[PDB]
Amino acid sequence: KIEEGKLVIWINGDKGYNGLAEVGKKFEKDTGIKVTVEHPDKLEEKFPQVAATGDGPDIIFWAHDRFGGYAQSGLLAEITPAAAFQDKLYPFTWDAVRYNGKLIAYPIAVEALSLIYNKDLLPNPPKTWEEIPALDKELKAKGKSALMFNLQEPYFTWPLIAADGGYAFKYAAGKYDIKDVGVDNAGAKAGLTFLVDLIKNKHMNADTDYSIAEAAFNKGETAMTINGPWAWSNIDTSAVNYGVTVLPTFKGQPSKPFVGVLSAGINAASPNKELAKEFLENYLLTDEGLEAVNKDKPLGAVALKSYEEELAKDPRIAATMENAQKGEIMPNIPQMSAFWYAVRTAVINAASGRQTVDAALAAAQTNAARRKPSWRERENNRRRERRRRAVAAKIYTGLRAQGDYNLPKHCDNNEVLKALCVEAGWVVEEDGTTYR
Amino acid sequence: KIEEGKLVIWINGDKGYNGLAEVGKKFEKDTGIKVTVEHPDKLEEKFPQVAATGDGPDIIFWAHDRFGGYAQSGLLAEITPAAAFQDKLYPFTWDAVRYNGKLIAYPIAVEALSLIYNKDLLPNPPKTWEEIPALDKELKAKGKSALMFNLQEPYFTWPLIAADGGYAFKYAAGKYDIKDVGVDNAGAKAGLTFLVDLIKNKHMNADTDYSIAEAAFNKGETAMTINGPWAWSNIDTSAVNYGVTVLPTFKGQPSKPFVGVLSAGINAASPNKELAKEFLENYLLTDEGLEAVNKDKPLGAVALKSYEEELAKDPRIAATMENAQKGEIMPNIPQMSAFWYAVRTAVINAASGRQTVDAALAAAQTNAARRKPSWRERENNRRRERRRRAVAAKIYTGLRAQGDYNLPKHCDNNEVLKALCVEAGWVVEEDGTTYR
DNA sequence: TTCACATATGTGAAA
DNA sequence: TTCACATATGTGAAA
Ligand SMILES: OC[C@H]1O[C@H](O[C@H]2[C@H](O)[C@@H](O)[C@@H](O)O[C@@H]2CO)[C@H](O)[C@@H](O)[C@@H]1O
Ligand SMILES: OC[C@H]1O[C@H](O[C@H]2[C@H](O)[C@@H](O)[C@@H](O)O[C@@H]2CO)[C@H](O)[C@@H](O)[C@@H]1O
């Protein structure tokens, strides 16, 4: 839980939490507050569950796409940065982190996936997805593979799914339209079918996850991987001479990644809103602080306009942004979570053979906008059925008490119902078939 | 799924999977068989789910406590090492992987928790738990804590619960009595009370999981932790000058850690049982084999006598075996996962204040002893209720078709039953109160 | 041991 | 939307 005068932080385990830890301790020196950094599991999941009850973090670092469902659930404090401060960060970043006309988080870094490749094994990386099967057959003879990446999270497969026209929610007339979902269209189909054919043809494994893919690339057993700027640090410490480049094209179209802005909203229930706002506006959204995080695991193209000038020279970032320009910023709306779960289920079920590609994406397209019943709605149902059983139980209690039927010492209500039926001149068969 | 010609291994994420991989690489070099080592989360829970359908890895590594349940489920191959090979391993480690008279895994190494303390920060570590609150007062004056260890897995707290008399399943007449559980006795209550009192009086934090406790000791913010030999590697790379010593006493009694034998089981569905047996007997369970794993993360006291006589020279292993002597080998019976689930919920509930100690342990006693109904018993129940509903449905089907009851276009069975009641000479109020 | 009503929620109906 | 039987399993009674 939260306690005043302390600072506990939540950020995903693939980010530079230790680098932030370094920043939190210097916040100690200036203002005296102890700041701890914890990298929990499924934090994007645990937060909307625990924050209701007061338990949770002062701050949560996460991509912006989930904050719209959060903010609409009243979990985040509205953000009040000076007009001078907004100018310090790129306007498209503030746009990503704004829901309904209120700024719910601080933009920190812009993230896009890129193709990462081993130059020693592959000095010239492929420009197309279509050439990856042939290239894998070549490298298999040398004891390598062409490409491994996280097939458990749809974030990593969406670029291929979008290339030929697959889309989540079509933005039309100034808004995202949840009636027009494109996870079921011909571009989406072709994208997934190709990914599955790669698996069918033993060029990838359906079980490959984030950890397996990183270890294979970092040890040099795979020539390529798809990942974001956070992964660069571990490749750095490895022995692999790598490059960061544009994603392969599919059917001649670019790979279209979903661009996430790593944001930071504050726990509406925190006793330290401004004692944490010191951190966020005057400590992290600063050049010298972002360096500390970026030094641990790279942040990507940070939203601070002054530090991005230095980082933008890095050819790896230029590539990251080259991919971003070809993709789209994620919507931040509430339906994102249901979209991600539906697409996650569709990829895994098609990758594993559990469902055909058509069946998987068809199921996904209906779930991408499924409404989650409200608490009151669940309580409506719960109470209605409690009433229904209470009425029946009183009927049978009375029948057993005053009926004087010829019943066994112990019997279920069906036997009572049968003895009430015959009394009313019905005959009930053994299996329930009933008639006058 | 397992494939002929390759070996996939599952080992926990805190073990030296990178060292195990190096062993795989030698196997692949002498015999030509590829070996992939993976460390997926919740692997001890994922294996029994996938292996029941013939999926899962070729070899699964875990402490021996979990294998009995795997064997009762027919998920493991029987280990058939020649007598010559069995003799190379300590008899008691073979006992740990014996189930219904058969060997169900290869023992690898003996694991026991120890007290890990920062020599510089805390010379002469405490000999009792009772002096721990006092030692935290002084240490908090220097801005440090006394003790942080994983509070989310009961493994780490069990030594204190068992100290004054808590036990899991009582051994009697040559077998563990699954009905005689000792998680509720006075000794267990005294141990969990002392632990909760540490949190109440602010000497410990209830949310502390493995990574928080590890980062704290390694960074130098706590004078002690409780952990196994796998964690020394990470401590070594840190600045900290650490010692490994006997766990403190509780109420003048030694702490009694549950002793684990890290074990390798062979999936019953693997078409590579001979290859797996060759890899385990002639590559892993060799001096060179265990050394490469051990160098990655220390294994503890290995079961192979030849390499153990070298590892025993290490004072950290002597301590670890000093704690082991005070504890007990874990049972391997299938009921062990139900005992761990119960105690896990108990410690977390008491640590958090969601339950009293007495209430949390009472519920854990009942859960740990709970007789798990068999599939057939589950099926009997399912079928019985299915039959009961079906008979009811027919009775109401017939009543609606032939009743002419003056019922609305659509109405629930309760209303049909009401109509029947009045036809038979009853009155039924709205609320179900029924009398003749 | 078997058994039966209780349980919140699921599937899908009727608007 | 609200509604209602179905769902496997829970709780606990009666041997
Ligand atoms: O896979 C669905 C998932 O995608 C994104 O998660 C990213 C995250 O944005 C990155 O910062 C990094 O942690 O990798 C994640 C994928 O493993 C979305 O942000 C997230 O909401 C969505 O569920
Ligand atoms: O916490 C319950 C847990 O205890 C043991 O797990 C140990 C494991 O033996 C060690 O090798 C190490 O990895 O730490 C684990 C605890 O997090 C039991 O072996 C396990 O079955 C049980 O659930």
Residue numbers in the entry:
A (entry chain D), B (entry chain C): -347 to 88
Please quote the paper that reports this structure.
However, single cis‐elements enriched in brassinosteroid‐induced genes do not support binding of either redox form, nor does BIL1/BZR1 DBD heterodimerize with PIF4 DBD on these elements.
The plant‐specific transcription factor BRZ‐INSENSITIVE‐LONG 1 (BIL1)/BRASSINAZOLE‐RESISTANT 1 (BZR1) regulates the growth of Arabidopsis thaliana via brassinosteroid signaling, acting as both a gene repressor and activator. Its upregulation requires environmental cues mediated by PHYTOCHROME INTERACTING FACTOR 4 (PIF4), with oxidative modifications via H2O2 enhancing their interaction. However, the nature of the tripartite complex of cis‐elements, BIL1/BZR1, and PIF4 under redox changes remains unclear. Here, we demonstrate that oxidation of the DNA‐binding domain (DBD) of BIL1/BZR1 alters its DNA‐binding ability.
